[PDB]
């Protein structure tokens, strides 16, 4: 069972809609979770005009019902200091349902 050791400031953006239909994100902070962060095989990835450096980072937190504040939705991102971990998906790692796998990137521009 996972050994949780990092403090990840979970962050959810409020979506202020603009006139054209596109929302504007704020990334106001949410309450902090505890998690383990297990790396994957990382390599740099061609962005737009940026040679973005990415690593897979399966993050494991504890669980909650889907209408609770403690669930990381894939809308949200983690942030440890200045290292933003995006959330690709959340997937309910444990069999009994105690732990959630998340999926991250840590795309540093490099």
């Amino acid at each position: 069972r996972p050994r949780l050791n990092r403090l990840l400031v979970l962050e959810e953006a409020v979506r202020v809609a603009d006139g054209a239909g596109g929302h504007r994100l704020d990334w106001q902070a949410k309450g902090e979770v505890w998690a383990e962060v297990t790396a994957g095989s990382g390599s740099e990835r061609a962005g737009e005009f940026v040679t973005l450096a990415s690593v897979p980072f399966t993050i494991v937190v504890r669980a909650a019902p889907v209408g609770a504040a403690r669930r990381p939705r894939p809308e949200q991102r983690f942030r440890e200091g200045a290292r933003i971990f995006r959330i690709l998906a959340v997937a309910e790692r444990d069999r009994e349902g105690h732990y959630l796998s998340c999926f991250a990137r840590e795309e540093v521009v490099a």
Binding site: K30, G31, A64, A68, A69
Partner: peptide, 12 residues
């Protein structure tokens, strides 16, 4: 138990 620090629920 490392539940969570600053959530608005905090009491479930």
């Amino acid at each position: 138990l490392r539940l969570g620090t600053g959530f608005a629920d905090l009491g479930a």
